[PDB]
């Protein structure tokens, strides 16, 4: 089915013709448009009072990255490199070796946050919930070098944000 957006014939009875003459001379349809903007003047504005108020977000929000731990404090990451393999941007760089206790752990874990596209594939790929995108989006920096995260930065992010990250994962892990 289709419809015509603009295929109508104006009527030619004297009343309709005068109605259009009054429209042309008295600007009635322009006055009508002024009414709409006037109504908006007296509507409450939609503006929120940032930074004292914040736009709403959901548990799935993809923000700044963080490396997580088990409740014992051991790192979850076991250097499988799945996140590195899937990263569409090649933003992840990893090196690994047996730890002094034999554990399979990384010695390098970098995320170039200026390469990253904040797609969340890395956290989908991680089999142990080690790498996540946290809820923080307020981490703009004054220098480029400050956005080249190494393992120490990412672990500090996890320790900094774990309280929120764990609750966000609790809310959404049953959709995953």
């Amino acid at each position: 089915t289709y419809k015509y957006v603009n295929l109508r014939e104006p009527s030619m009875d004297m009343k309709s013709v005068t109605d259009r003459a009054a429209q042309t001379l008295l600007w009635t349809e322009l006055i009508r448009g002024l009414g709409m903007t006037l109504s908006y003047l007296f509507r409450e504005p939609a503006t929120i009072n940032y930074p004292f108020e914040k736009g709403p977000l959901s548990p799935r929000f993809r923000g700044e990255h963080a490396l997580r731990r088990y409740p014992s404090g051991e790192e979850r990451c076991i250097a499988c490199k799945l996140c590195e393999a899937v990263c569409p941007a090649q933003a992840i760089t990893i090196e690994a070796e047996p730890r002094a206790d034999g554990s399979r752990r990384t010695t390098r874990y970098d995320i170039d946050m200026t390469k990253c596209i904040y797609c969340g594939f890395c956290q989908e790929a991680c089999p142990v919930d080690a790498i996540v995108e946290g809820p923080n989006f307020e981490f703009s920096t004054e220098t480029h070098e400050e956005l080249l995260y190494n393992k120490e930065k990412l672990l500090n992010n996890g320790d900094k944000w774990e309280a929120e990250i764990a609750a966000n994962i609790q809310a959404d892990y049953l959709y995953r």
Binding site: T37, L38, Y40, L41, R43, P45, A46, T47
Partner: peptide, 10 residues
């Protein structure tokens, strides 16, 4: 301000 409120902002 007048434009803003007519535009649903402040």
């Amino acid at each position: 301000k007048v434009l803003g409120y007519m535009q649903l902002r402040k």
